[PDB]
Design a protein around this ligand. Structure first.
Ligand SMILES: [Zn+2]
Length: 229
RNA sequence: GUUAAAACUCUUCUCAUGCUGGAUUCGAAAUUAGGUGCGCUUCGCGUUU
């Protein structure tokens, strides 16, 4: 097991809508998965076939959680929309969003300059050979996460491709960094599969668990995530 | 293989109006149209009582 670390920053702003006209503050790992699968199909890579597999259970993408001037990731504030890093507060929040009115199109973005965590957890080392190639393409051109990729919104640039290994969590009690798939969890989560080869945009809805919640689970390996805490 | 994809903050509107490169100072200070050359040459106040 290993992971590729990164201080992924935004060249142009990203627009990710949620339900209830909510715009997400930071970019999520689902968006990274959806973009990297387009990369692997576009470069005729084999893992693209696994990219259209939503339960491959290797190459799991952790959320692009924002990084602070404290050098640490903003830990998500428990049961709250905004985030707060363990060192100081520096609290992210909505102020970073801007209401956009552009040619009829009224939407929102999140501004550029803030840095976000790259963390691609990979299990199979055979997949790491293609993983080095896809992080090496982004290294040259960039990745686009958001809406209006063809208009140019969402351009991301890595500044630190680091393939440093890691180990899973220890405590059973873990904090939910990202929203987790837990049935009858009363926190509705929506994403989609596009399947551009065969069309049929999906808009898959679910009722998983929300982020910022301490939960005890001995059967935990750590799209939810496990914070060691 | 991103609750996607698709949609150019676009159109209209002259940095314009008002203000003179003007005021002061003389082309005049120095220099004699001067120097050379003879109105000369020729002809008796005759004749007549
Ligand atoms: Zn901080």
């Amino acid at each position: 097991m290993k992971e590729i670390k990164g201080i992924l920053e935004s060249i142009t702003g990203f627009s990710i809508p949620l339900d209830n006209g909510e715009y997400a503050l930071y970019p999520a790992g689902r968006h990274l998965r959806g973009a990297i699968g387009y990369i692997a199909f576009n470069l005729d890579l084999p893992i693209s076939s696994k990219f259209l597999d939503f339960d491959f259970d290797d190459i799991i993408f952790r959320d692009l959680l924002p990084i602070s001037k404290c050098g640490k990731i903003f830990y998500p504030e428990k049961n709250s929309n905004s985030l707060k890093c363990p060192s100081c507060n520096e609290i992210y929040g909505s102020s970073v969003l801007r209401n956009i009115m552009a040619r009829g199109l009224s939407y929102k973005e999140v501004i550029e300059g803030k840095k976000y965590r790259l963390s691609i957890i990979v299990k199979d080392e055979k997949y790491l050979n293609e993983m080095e190639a896809i992080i090496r393409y982004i290294l040259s051109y960039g990745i686009y996460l958001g809406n209006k990729v063809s208009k140019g919104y969402g351009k991301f640039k890595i500044k630190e491709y680091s393939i440093v290994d890691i180990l899973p969590v220890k405590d059973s009690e873990v904090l939910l960094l990202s929203d987790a798939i837990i049935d009858n969890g009363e926190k509705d989560i929506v994403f989609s599969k596009k399947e551009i080869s065969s069309s049929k945009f999906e808009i898959i809805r679910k009722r998983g668990k929300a982020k910022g919640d301490i939960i005890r689970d001995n059967n935990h390996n750590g799209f939810g995530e496990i914070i060691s805490l």
